[PDB]
Amino acid sequence: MDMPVERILEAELAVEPNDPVTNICQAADKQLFTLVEWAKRIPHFSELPLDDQVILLRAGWNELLIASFSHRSIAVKDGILLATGLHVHRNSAHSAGVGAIFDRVLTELVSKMRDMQMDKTELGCLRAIVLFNPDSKGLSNPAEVEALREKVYASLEAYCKHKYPEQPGRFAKLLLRLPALRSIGLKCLEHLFFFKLIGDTPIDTFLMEMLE
Amino acid sequence: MDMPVERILEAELAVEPNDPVTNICQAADKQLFTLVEWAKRIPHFSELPLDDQVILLRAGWNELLIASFSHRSIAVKDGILLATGLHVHRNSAHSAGVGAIFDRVLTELVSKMRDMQMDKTELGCLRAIVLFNPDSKGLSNPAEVEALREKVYASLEAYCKHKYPEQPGRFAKLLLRLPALRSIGLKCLEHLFFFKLIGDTPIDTFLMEMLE
Amino acid sequence: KHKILHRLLQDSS
Amino acid sequence: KHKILHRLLQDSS
Ligand SMILES: O=C(O)CCc1nc(-c2ccccc2)c(-c2cc(Cl)cc(Cl)c2)o1
Ligand SMILES: O=C(O)CCc1nc(-c2ccccc2)c(-c2cc(Cl)cc(Cl)c2)o1
């Protein structure tokens, strides 16, 4: 295999851990460092030119962080588990004025992951697909990233057909959480740009750099 | 079949046709009427409660219109073909100040449809999937819409495996244009809200109603 | 009050 | 000038 699911799963395992908006932002900044470590352990990522590694993560980071804390939250009720160890409940999120986007994360991502019991190899592969985004602007070789995307979802199809043979639509189902992910990532990003613009919230240096 | 691709293809065939932003907006308003006609010819859509039919189209319309004019544009170079019969070139789009989103439509949708020769049954099924969006807020029975989504992408998988057996990754590839679609739909929507807010552009009544 | 959408969706044609 | 991202991405670990 040019893209074995074993190594993608290891990537995930290797990086395994009062204003709620402040908490969320501390966690996000913490996990930005862990994101870079994760990406390097995805097969072939580190072999890309540094400029393209930068473009993919600049393009992907918000969706990659959202995919993690969503999957990490499956066993939680009406709330998310942060990397800091702190659970945030929808009541808290609503009371800080981020209820709507918070409800979207619960209903479109967390719930859907719990319902189908999305395993960690599957989270891995979805995040790998999101990382290898051939639509990212300025890539020196979009075909290369497209071909890496192709190898990830071919391995994912085969993992699903083998591991859950009883669920013939599981592969499609996994791929059909990516639009919601794109959508929630863009609304989250619009919120962080607002927290920044306003100076309501402490934005640590690496989060800050991803918002410039 | 509970969701045969024959009928989805017929739906597509049945509805087949200077400020460029004005032109785009006239076309959009024209096609909103054709969208409703299209939706009714998708199997099971008309059987949903009127309230849910409203919610799905309110949720879907922008992506449904973008999917159409993108596929309609495959044979066009560096431009889109409107339903009005008018081609818009990227030079025009850039000169009206909508180059960036216009380039996104070309690079992420039109080009990708041309490259893979996305056929009309496939456009049909992708639009059906987008229509049957179980994440839409306020649906009386999300499970029903989820189950209709499931039946569309099962038929699509089978159409692809049968029609293009040489391309084992074609199904995944089709589903992996939906995130870009979600993304471009939201940026298009943000533009139209700006044209409206500003009174730069004539917004006809039905377009106007979809922006309230 | 989605007047126009509601009307197009009732009409049996 | 993505200073912090560039530095984390060079470091061989
Ligand atoms: O603990 C982690 O793994 C990271 C937590 C985290 N990371 C983001 C984020 C969103 C988008 C981009 C980058 C980080 C968010 C977030 C969550 C909600 Cl419900 C709302 C908002 Cl505005 C943000 O939370
Ligand atoms: O002729 C048709 O089939 C419809 C044309 C059309 N329909 C939208 C639209 C976008 C979003 C929502 C609804 C309609 C647009 C559009 C295209 C660009 Cl490149 C930019 C923008 Cl801002 C809009 O063009």
Short mmCIF file of C-alpha atoms and ligand atoms in Angstrom, two decimals:
data_model
loop_
_atom_site.label_atom_id
_atom_site.label_comp_id
_atom_site.label_asym_id
_atom_site.label_seq_id
_atom_site.Cartn_x
_atom_site.Cartn_y
_atom_site.Cartn_z
CA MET A 1 0.00 0.00 0.00
CA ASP A 2 1.22 3.56 -0.89
CA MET A 3 -1.19 4.90 1.86
CA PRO A 4 -1.86 2.23 4.55
CA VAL A 5 -4.62 3.01 7.16
CA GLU A 6 -2.35 1.48 9.86
CA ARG A 7 0.02 4.54 9.68
CA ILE A 8 -2.90 7.08 9.54
CA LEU A 9 -4.35 5.39 12.72
CA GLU A 10 -0.85 5.59 14.41
CA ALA A 11 -0.77 9.35 13.52
CA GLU A 12 -4.07 9.78 15.45
CA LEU A 13 -2.92 7.60 18.42
CA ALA A 14 0.50 9.39 18.64
CA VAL A 15 -1.08 12.89 19.28
CA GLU A 16 -3.76 11.74 21.83
CA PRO A 17 -4.28 13.96 24.94
CA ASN A 18 -14.68 31.45 33.04
CA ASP A 19 -15.39 32.45 29.33
CA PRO A 20 -15.94 29.25 27.26
CA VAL A 21 -14.76 31.16 24.11
CA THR A 22 -11.44 31.84 25.96
CA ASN A 23 -11.22 28.11 26.88
CA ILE A 24 -12.03 27.03 23.28
CA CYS A 25 -9.31 29.48 22.01
CA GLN A 26 -6.61 28.26 24.51
CA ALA A 27 -7.40 24.64 23.41
CA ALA A 28 -7.31 25.60 19.68
CA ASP A 29 -3.88 27.25 20.09
CA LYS A 30 -2.56 24.25 22.08
CA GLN A 31 -3.84 21.81 19.39
CA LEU A 32 -2.30 23.85 16.51
CA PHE A 33 1.15 22.57 17.70
CA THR A 34 -0.22 18.97 17.90
CA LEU A 35 -1.78 19.41 14.40
CA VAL A 36 1.68 20.03 12.81
CA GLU A 37 3.06 16.88 14.61
CA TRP A 38 -0.02 14.88 13.37
CA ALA A 39 0.45 16.07 9.74
CA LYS A 40 4.12 14.96 9.65
CA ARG A 41 3.07 11.37 10.66
CA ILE A 42 0.58 11.18 7.71
CA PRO A 43 2.40 9.22 4.97
CA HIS A 44 3.97 11.45 2.21
CA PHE A 45 2.98 14.83 3.81
CA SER A 46 6.58 15.61 4.96
CA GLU A 47 7.83 14.79 1.38
CA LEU A 48 5.79 17.70 -0.10
CA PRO A 49 7.66 21.01 -0.64
CA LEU A 50 7.57 23.09 2.63
CA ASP A 51 5.49 25.78 0.76
CA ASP A 52 2.73 23.22 -0.03
CA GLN A 53 2.83 21.75 3.50
CA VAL A 54 2.17 25.37 4.68
CA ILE A 55 -0.68 25.89 2.11
CA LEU A 56 -2.45 22.57 3.04
CA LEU A 57 -2.39 23.27 6.81
CA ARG A 58 -3.36 26.96 6.32
CA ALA A 59 -6.26 25.63 4.17
CA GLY A 60 -7.11 22.64 6.46
CA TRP A 61 -6.35 23.54 10.12
CA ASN A 62 -9.84 24.73 11.14
CA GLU A 63 -11.56 21.58 9.73
CA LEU A 64 -8.78 19.31 11.12
CA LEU A 65 -9.23 20.74 14.67
CA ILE A 66 -13.06 20.52 14.39
CA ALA A 67 -12.89 16.83 13.21
CA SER A 68 -10.68 15.95 16.26
CA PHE A 69 -12.74 17.58 19.08
CA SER A 70 -16.01 16.32 17.47
CA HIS A 71 -14.80 12.62 17.44
CA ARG A 72 -13.28 13.11 20.95
CA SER A 73 -16.81 14.22 22.10
CA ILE A 74 -18.92 11.15 20.95
CA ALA A 75 -19.21 9.73 24.54
CA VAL A 76 -20.23 13.24 25.82
CA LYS A 77 -23.90 14.40 26.13
CA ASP A 78 -24.96 17.84 24.73
CA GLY A 79 -21.32 19.10 24.98
CA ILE A 80 -17.71 18.87 23.65
CA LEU A 81 -14.48 17.65 25.33
CA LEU A 82 -11.54 20.10 24.80
CA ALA A 83 -7.88 18.92 24.55
CA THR A 84 -7.29 20.92 27.82
CA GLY A 85 -9.45 18.18 29.55
CA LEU A 86 -12.35 20.69 29.98
CA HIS A 87 -15.88 19.64 28.81
CA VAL A 88 -18.02 22.52 27.40
CA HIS A 89 -21.85 22.05 27.57
CA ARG A 90 -24.30 23.64 25.03
CA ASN A 91 -25.82 25.69 27.92
CA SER A 92 -22.34 27.36 28.41
CA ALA A 93 -21.90 27.84 24.62
CA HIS A 94 -25.39 29.50 24.36
CA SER A 95 -24.58 31.79 27.36
CA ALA A 96 -21.34 33.06 25.66
CA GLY A 97 -23.38 33.76 22.45
CA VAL A 98 -22.03 30.82 20.32
CA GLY A 99 -25.04 28.45 20.76
CA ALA A 100 -25.99 28.25 17.05
CA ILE A 101 -22.53 27.11 15.78
CA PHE A 102 -22.17 24.91 18.91
CA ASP A 103 -25.56 23.21 18.13
CA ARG A 104 -24.31 22.67 14.53
CA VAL A 105 -21.20 20.83 15.84
CA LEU A 106 -23.40 18.59 18.07
CA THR A 107 -26.13 17.86 15.45
CA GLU A 108 -24.06 17.58 12.19
CA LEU A 109 -20.77 16.13 13.52
CA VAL A 110 -20.72 14.70 17.12
CA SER A 111 -24.16 13.03 16.94
CA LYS A 112 -23.48 11.62 13.41
CA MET A 113 -20.09 10.18 14.61
CA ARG A 114 -21.81 8.57 17.70
CA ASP A 115 -24.76 7.17 15.65
CA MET A 116 -22.43 5.41 13.12
CA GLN A 117 -19.65 4.76 15.78
CA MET A 118 -17.03 6.38 13.47
CA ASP A 119 -13.78 4.65 14.59
CA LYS A 120 -10.36 6.36 14.84
CA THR A 121 -8.99 4.89 11.55
CA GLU A 122 -12.04 6.53 9.87
CA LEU A 123 -11.47 9.92 11.64
CA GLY A 124 -7.79 9.55 10.57
CA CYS A 125 -8.66 8.97 6.88
CA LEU A 126 -11.30 11.81 6.78
CA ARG A 127 -8.70 14.19 8.31
CA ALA A 128 -6.06 12.91 5.79
CA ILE A 129 -8.55 13.59 2.93
CA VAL A 130 -9.16 17.14 4.34
CA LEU A 131 -5.35 17.67 4.67
CA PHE A 132 -4.72 16.57 1.05
CA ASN A 133 -7.03 19.25 -0.39
CA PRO A 134 -6.06 19.71 -4.07
CA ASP A 135 -8.28 22.87 -4.29
CA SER A 136 -5.88 24.77 -1.89
CA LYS A 137 -4.66 27.95 -3.67
CA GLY A 138 -0.97 28.19 -4.72
CA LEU A 139 0.03 24.46 -4.55
CA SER A 140 3.11 23.81 -6.76
CA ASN A 141 1.62 20.39 -7.84
CA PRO A 142 -2.18 20.03 -7.28
CA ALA A 143 -2.09 16.62 -9.16
CA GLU A 144 0.29 15.23 -6.44
CA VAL A 145 -2.14 16.25 -3.61
CA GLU A 146 -5.14 14.97 -5.67
CA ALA A 147 -3.32 11.59 -6.08
CA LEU A 148 -2.59 11.48 -2.29
CA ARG A 149 -6.30 12.30 -1.65
CA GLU A 150 -7.22 9.44 -4.12
CA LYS A 151 -4.94 6.93 -2.24
CA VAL A 152 -6.48 7.87 1.20
CA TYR A 153 -10.15 7.36 0.17
CA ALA A 154 -9.28 4.13 -1.75
CA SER A 155 -7.72 2.77 1.54
CA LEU A 156 -10.78 4.07 3.49
CA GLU A 157 -13.27 2.34 1.07
CA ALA A 158 -11.29 -0.96 1.48
CA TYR A 159 -11.03 -0.57 5.35
CA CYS A 160 -14.85 0.01 5.50
CA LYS A 161 -15.74 -2.90 3.07
CA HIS A 162 -13.43 -5.19 5.18
CA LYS A 163 -14.10 -3.94 8.78
CA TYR A 164 -17.89 -3.19 8.43
CA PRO A 165 -18.92 -5.44 5.47
CA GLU A 166 -22.58 -5.36 6.84
CA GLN A 167 -22.75 -1.54 6.12
CA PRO A 168 -22.35 -1.11 2.31
CA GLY A 169 -23.13 2.67 2.52
CA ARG A 170 -20.67 3.43 5.42
CA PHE A 171 -17.97 4.83 3.03
CA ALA A 172 -20.41 7.31 1.33
CA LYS A 173 -21.75 8.21 4.85
CA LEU A 174 -18.19 9.10 6.07
CA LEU A 175 -17.49 11.25 2.95
CA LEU A 176 -20.90 12.95 3.43
CA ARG A 177 -19.85 14.49 6.80
CA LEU A 178 -17.16 16.60 4.93
CA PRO A 179 -19.65 19.22 3.57
CA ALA A 180 -20.98 19.85 7.09
CA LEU A 181 -17.30 20.03 8.20
CA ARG A 182 -16.47 22.60 5.51
CA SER A 183 -19.57 24.62 6.52
CA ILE A 184 -18.91 24.53 10.31
CA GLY A 185 -15.18 25.33 9.72
CA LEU A 186 -16.06 28.52 7.79
CA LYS A 187 -18.61 29.69 10.44
CA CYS A 188 -16.09 28.94 13.24
CA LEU A 189 -13.44 30.93 11.33
CA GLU A 190 -15.86 33.91 10.92
CA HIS A 191 -16.38 33.80 14.80
CA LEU A 192 -12.62 33.72 15.60
CA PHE A 193 -12.05 36.70 13.17
CA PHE A 194 -14.72 38.52 15.21
CA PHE A 195 -13.18 37.60 18.65
CA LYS A 196 -9.82 38.87 17.21
CA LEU A 197 -11.21 42.09 15.59
CA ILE A 198 -13.01 42.97 18.90
CA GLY A 199 -10.29 42.15 21.54
CA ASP A 200 -13.01 40.51 23.75
CA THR A 201 -10.90 37.26 23.93
CA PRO A 202 -7.18 36.44 24.47
CA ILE A 203 -5.91 34.89 21.15
CA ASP A 204 -2.52 33.12 21.78
CA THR A 205 0.30 33.62 19.20
CA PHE A 206 -0.11 30.54 16.88
CA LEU A 207 -3.95 30.84 16.69
CA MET A 208 -3.31 34.57 15.97
CA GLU A 209 -0.86 33.68 13.11
CA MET A 210 -3.46 31.32 11.50
CA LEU A 211 -5.96 34.32 11.54
CA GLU A 212 -3.55 36.67 9.55
CA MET B 1 -35.67 0.59 -7.09
CA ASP B 2 -37.13 3.09 -4.52
CA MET B 3 -34.87 5.82 -6.14
CA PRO B 4 -34.07 4.97 -9.81
CA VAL B 5 -31.42 7.17 -11.59
CA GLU B 6 -33.63 7.09 -14.74
CA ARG B 7 -36.21 9.44 -13.07
CA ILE B 8 -33.47 11.75 -11.58
CA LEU B 9 -31.97 12.04 -15.14
CA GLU B 10 -35.50 12.83 -16.57
CA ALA B 11 -35.84 15.59 -13.87
CA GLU B 12 -32.61 17.17 -15.24
CA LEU B 13 -33.67 16.75 -18.93
CA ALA B 14 -37.21 18.16 -18.26
CA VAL B 15 -35.89 21.59 -17.00
CA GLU B 16 -33.19 22.10 -19.72
CA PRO B 17 -32.89 25.64 -21.24
CA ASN B 18 -23.92 45.49 -19.00
CA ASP B 19 -23.22 44.49 -15.30
CA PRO B 20 -22.40 40.73 -15.15
CA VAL B 21 -23.65 40.67 -11.49
CA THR B 22 -27.05 41.96 -12.79
CA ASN B 23 -27.01 39.23 -15.50
CA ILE B 24 -26.06 36.51 -12.95
CA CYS B 25 -28.93 37.76 -10.66
CA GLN B 26 -31.57 37.81 -13.48
CA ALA B 27 -30.51 34.21 -14.38
CA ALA B 28 -30.59 33.11 -10.68
CA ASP B 29 -34.14 34.49 -10.26
CA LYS B 30 -35.28 32.84 -13.53
CA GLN B 31 -33.78 29.47 -12.45
CA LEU B 32 -35.40 29.63 -8.96
CA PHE B 33 -38.77 28.89 -10.71
CA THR B 34 -37.16 26.02 -12.70
CA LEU B 35 -35.57 24.70 -9.44
CA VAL B 36 -39.03 24.18 -7.82
CA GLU B 37 -40.21 22.30 -11.01
CA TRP B 38 -36.98 20.18 -10.92
CA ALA B 39 -37.46 19.30 -7.21
CA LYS B 40 -41.04 18.05 -7.77
CA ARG B 41 -39.76 15.57 -10.46
CA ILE B 42 -37.20 14.07 -7.97
CA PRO B 43 -38.83 10.86 -6.67
CA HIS B 44 -40.49 11.23 -3.18
CA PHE B 45 -39.77 15.02 -2.80
CA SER B 46 -43.44 16.02 -3.46
CA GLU B 47 -44.56 13.39 -0.83
CA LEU B 48 -42.71 15.26 1.97
CA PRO B 49 -44.80 17.68 4.10
CA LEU B 50 -44.92 21.15 2.36
CA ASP B 51 -43.00 22.64 5.39
CA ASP B 52 -40.04 20.24 4.81
CA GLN B 53 -40.11 20.79 1.02
CA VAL B 54 -39.74 24.54 1.88
CA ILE B 55 -36.88 23.87 4.41
CA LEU B 56 -34.90 21.63 1.94
CA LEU B 57 -35.08 24.16 -0.94
CA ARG B 58 -34.36 27.13 1.39
CA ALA B 59 -31.34 25.10 2.61
CA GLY B 60 -30.33 23.78 -0.86
CA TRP B 61 -31.21 26.37 -3.56
CA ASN B 62 -27.84 28.16 -3.75
CA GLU B 63 -25.87 24.86 -4.13
CA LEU B 64 -28.51 23.44 -6.54
CA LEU B 65 -28.24 26.52 -8.85
CA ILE B 66 -24.39 26.45 -8.64
CA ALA B 67 -24.27 22.69 -9.53
CA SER B 68 -26.47 23.34 -12.64
CA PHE B 69 -24.59 26.32 -14.19
CA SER B 70 -21.21 24.66 -13.39
CA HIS B 71 -22.15 21.39 -15.28
CA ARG B 72 -23.78 23.50 -18.07
CA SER B 73 -20.36 25.30 -18.42
CA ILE B 74 -18.02 22.23 -18.97
CA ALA B 75 -17.69 22.88 -22.77
CA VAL B 76 -16.95 26.61 -22.05
CA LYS B 77 -13.38 28.02 -21.64
CA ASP B 78 -12.54 30.32 -18.65
CA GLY B 79 -16.27 31.26 -18.30
CA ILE B 80 -19.82 30.13 -17.34
CA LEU B 81 -22.99 29.72 -19.47
CA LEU B 82 -26.09 31.33 -17.82
CA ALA B 83 -29.65 29.93 -18.29
CA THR B 84 -30.44 33.28 -20.07
CA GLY B 85 -28.12 31.98 -22.92
CA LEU B 86 -25.42 34.56 -21.94
CA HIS B 87 -21.80 33.31 -21.41
CA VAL B 88 -19.84 35.20 -18.68
CA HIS B 89 -16.00 35.15 -18.99
CA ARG B 90 -13.62 35.39 -15.95
CA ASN B 91 -12.30 38.74 -17.34
CA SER B 92 -15.90 40.17 -16.98
CA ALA B 93 -16.30 38.60 -13.49
CA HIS B 94 -12.93 40.14 -12.35
CA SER B 95 -13.96 43.57 -13.76
CA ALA B 96 -17.25 43.55 -11.71
CA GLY B 97 -15.20 42.65 -8.56
CA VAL B 98 -16.30 38.95 -8.27
CA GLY B 99 -13.13 37.37 -9.80
CA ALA B 100 -12.11 35.36 -6.70
CA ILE B 101 -15.44 33.48 -6.26
CA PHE B 102 -15.70 33.18 -10.09
CA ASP B 103 -12.19 31.57 -10.22
CA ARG B 104 -13.33 29.17 -7.43
CA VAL B 105 -16.33 28.05 -9.57
CA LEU B 106 -14.01 27.43 -12.59
CA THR B 107 -11.19 25.66 -10.66
CA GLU B 108 -13.17 23.60 -8.05
CA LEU B 109 -16.37 22.80 -10.00
CA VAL B 110 -16.39 23.43 -13.82
CA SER B 111 -12.84 22.15 -14.45
CA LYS B 112 -13.35 19.09 -12.16
CA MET B 113 -16.65 18.23 -14.00
CA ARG B 114 -14.88 18.56 -17.44
CA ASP B 115 -11.79 16.52 -16.34
CA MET B 116 -13.94 13.55 -15.12
CA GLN B 117 -16.73 14.16 -17.80
CA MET B 118 -19.41 14.17 -15.03
CA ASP B 119 -22.55 13.04 -16.95
CA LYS B 120 -26.09 14.39 -16.35
CA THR B 121 -27.28 11.34 -14.30
CA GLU B 122 -24.32 12.10 -11.97
CA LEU B 123 -25.17 15.87 -11.76
CA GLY B 124 -28.79 14.74 -11.10
CA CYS B 125 -27.81 12.41 -8.21
CA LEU B 126 -25.38 14.97 -6.62
CA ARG B 127 -28.17 17.61 -6.76
CA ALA B 128 -30.66 15.03 -5.31
CA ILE B 129 -28.17 14.32 -2.46
CA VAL B 130 -27.84 18.13 -1.83
CA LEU B 131 -31.69 18.48 -1.92
CA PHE B 132 -32.16 15.63 0.61
CA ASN B 133 -30.03 17.36 3.27
CA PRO B 134 -30.96 15.79 6.64
CA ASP B 135 -28.96 18.54 8.50
CA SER B 136 -31.54 21.23 7.37
CA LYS B 137 -32.95 22.94 10.50
CA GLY B 138 -36.62 22.35 11.45
CA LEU B 139 -37.35 19.17 9.38
CA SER B 140 -40.34 17.26 10.88
CA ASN B 141 -38.59 13.89 10.08
CA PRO B 142 -34.78 14.14 9.49
CA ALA B 143 -34.59 10.25 9.34
CA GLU B 144 -36.92 10.29 6.25
CA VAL B 145 -34.62 12.79 4.40
CA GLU B 146 -31.50 10.86 5.57
CA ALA B 147 -33.07 7.62 4.14
CA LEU B 148 -33.86 9.41 0.82
CA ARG B 149 -30.23 10.72 0.77
CA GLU B 150 -29.07 7.06 1.43
CA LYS B 151 -31.19 5.72 -1.51
CA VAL B 152 -29.79 8.40 -3.95
CA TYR B 153 -26.08 7.69 -3.26
CA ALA B 154 -26.68 3.89 -3.28
CA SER B 155 -28.21 4.30 -6.83
CA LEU B 156 -25.28 6.63 -7.78
CA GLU B 157 -22.62 4.09 -6.54
CA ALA B 158 -24.37 1.33 -8.62
CA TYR B 159 -24.74 3.63 -11.75
CA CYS B 160 -20.97 4.48 -11.51
CA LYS B 161 -19.83 0.81 -10.90
CA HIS B 162 -22.02 -0.23 -13.93
CA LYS B 163 -21.51 2.74 -16.36
CA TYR B 164 -17.77 3.46 -15.60
CA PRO B 165 -16.52 0.09 -14.20
CA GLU B 166 -12.90 1.13 -15.26
CA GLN B 167 -13.00 4.03 -12.68
CA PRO B 168 -13.35 2.42 -9.19
CA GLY B 169 -12.85 5.81 -7.43
CA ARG B 170 -15.41 7.78 -9.57
CA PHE B 171 -18.16 7.56 -6.85
CA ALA B 172 -15.86 8.98 -4.07
CA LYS B 173 -14.66 11.65 -6.61
CA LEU B 174 -18.30 12.78 -7.27
CA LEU B 175 -19.09 12.97 -3.50
CA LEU B 176 -15.82 14.92 -2.96
CA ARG B 177 -17.05 17.89 -5.09
CA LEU B 178 -19.84 18.54 -2.45
CA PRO B 179 -17.52 20.26 0.11
CA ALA B 180 -16.31 22.71 -2.57
CA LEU B 181 -20.01 23.16 -3.50
CA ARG B 182 -20.97 23.92 0.11
CA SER B 183 -18.04 26.39 0.34
CA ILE B 184 -18.76 28.21 -2.96
CA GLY B 185 -22.53 28.32 -2.12
CA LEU B 186 -21.84 30.12 1.19
CA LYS B 187 -19.43 32.66 -0.43
CA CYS B 188 -21.95 33.28 -3.28
CA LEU B 189 -24.70 33.81 -0.67
CA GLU B 190 -22.49 36.33 1.27
CA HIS B 191 -22.04 38.26 -2.11
CA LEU B 192 -25.80 38.34 -2.92
CA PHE B 193 -26.53 39.60 0.69
CA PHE B 194 -24.03 42.39 -0.07
CA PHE B 195 -25.57 43.26 -3.52
CA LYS B 196 -28.99 43.37 -1.71
CA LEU B 197 -27.79 45.39 1.37
CA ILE B 198 -26.14 47.97 -0.99
CA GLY B 199 -28.84 48.43 -3.72
CA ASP B 200 -26.05 48.35 -6.41
CA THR B 201 -27.93 45.52 -8.27
CA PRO B 202 -31.59 44.82 -9.24
CA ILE B 203 -32.68 41.71 -7.20
CA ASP B 204 -35.94 40.27 -8.72
CA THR B 205 -38.75 39.18 -6.31
CA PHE B 206 -38.07 35.39 -5.89
CA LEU B 207 -34.26 35.82 -5.50
CA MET B 208 -35.15 38.59 -2.98
CA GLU B 209 -37.47 36.19 -1.03
CA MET B 210 -34.68 33.53 -0.81
CA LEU B 211 -32.40 36.29 0.75
CA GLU B 212 -34.93 37.11 3.61
CA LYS C 1 -43.83 34.01 4.91
CA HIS C 2 -42.02 32.47 1.85
CA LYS C 3 -45.01 33.59 -0.35
CA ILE C 4 -43.61 32.74 -3.84
CA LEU C 5 -41.93 29.39 -2.89
CA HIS C 6 -45.10 28.09 -1.08
CA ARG C 7 -47.31 28.95 -4.15
CA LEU C 8 -44.99 27.20 -6.71
CA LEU C 9 -44.84 24.12 -4.40
CA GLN C 10 -48.68 23.62 -4.03
CA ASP C 11 -49.43 24.02 -7.79
CA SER C 12 -50.10 20.49 -9.21
CA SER C 13 -48.04 20.56 -12.51
CA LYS D 1 5.52 35.32 7.02
CA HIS D 2 3.89 32.31 8.82
CA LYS D 3 6.83 32.34 11.35
CA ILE D 4 5.56 29.72 13.87
CA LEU D 5 4.11 27.23 11.31
CA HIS D 6 7.33 27.27 9.15
CA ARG D 7 9.53 26.59 12.26
CA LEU D 8 7.39 23.62 13.52
CA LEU D 9 7.41 22.15 9.95
CA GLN D 10 11.27 22.19 9.46
CA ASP D 11 12.06 20.66 12.90
CA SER D 12 13.01 16.96 12.33
CA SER D 13 11.01 15.18 15.15
O1 LIG E 1 -9.94 21.25 21.79
C1 LIG E 1 -9.68 21.16 20.51
O2 LIG E 1 -9.31 20.13 19.97
C2 LIG E 1 -9.90 22.44 19.77
C3 LIG E 1 -11.14 23.18 20.22
C4 LIG E 1 -11.66 24.14 19.21
N1 LIG E 1 -11.06 24.55 18.14
C5 LIG E 1 -11.99 25.39 17.54
C6 LIG E 1 -11.64 26.02 16.25
C7 LIG E 1 -12.62 26.33 15.32
C8 LIG E 1 -12.26 26.84 14.08
C9 LIG E 1 -10.95 27.03 13.76
C10 LIG E 1 -9.98 26.70 14.66
C11 LIG E 1 -10.32 26.21 15.91
C12 LIG E 1 -13.11 25.45 18.30
C13 LIG E 1 -14.43 26.08 18.22
C14 LIG E 1 -15.56 25.40 18.68
C15 LIG E 1 -16.78 26.03 18.64
CL1 LIG E 1 -18.19 25.15 19.14
C16 LIG E 1 -16.93 27.32 18.17
C17 LIG E 1 -15.80 27.96 17.70
CL2 LIG E 1 -15.94 29.58 17.11
C18 LIG E 1 -14.56 27.36 17.72
O3 LIG E 1 -12.91 24.65 19.39
O1 LIG E 2 -27.70 30.66 -14.68
C1 LIG E 2 -27.93 29.90 -13.63
O2 LIG E 2 -28.22 28.73 -13.70
C2 LIG E 2 -27.79 30.64 -12.34
C3 LIG E 2 -26.61 31.59 -12.32
C4 LIG E 2 -26.14 31.93 -10.95
N1 LIG E 2 -26.75 31.68 -9.84
C5 LIG E 2 -25.87 32.16 -8.86
C6 LIG E 2 -26.24 32.01 -7.44
C7 LIG E 2 -25.27 31.87 -6.46
C8 LIG E 2 -25.63 31.65 -5.15
C9 LIG E 2 -26.95 31.55 -4.80
C10 LIG E 2 -27.91 31.66 -5.77
C11 LIG E 2 -27.56 31.91 -7.08
C12 LIG E 2 -24.77 32.69 -9.47
C13 LIG E 2 -23.50 33.27 -9.05
C14 LIG E 2 -22.34 33.01 -9.77
C15 LIG E 2 -21.16 33.61 -9.39
CL1 LIG E 2 -19.70 33.22 -10.24
C16 LIG E 2 -21.09 34.48 -8.32
C17 LIG E 2 -22.25 34.71 -7.61
CL2 LIG E 2 -22.22 35.81 -6.27
C18 LIG E 2 -23.45 34.12 -7.95
O3 LIG E 2 -24.94 32.55 -10.82
#
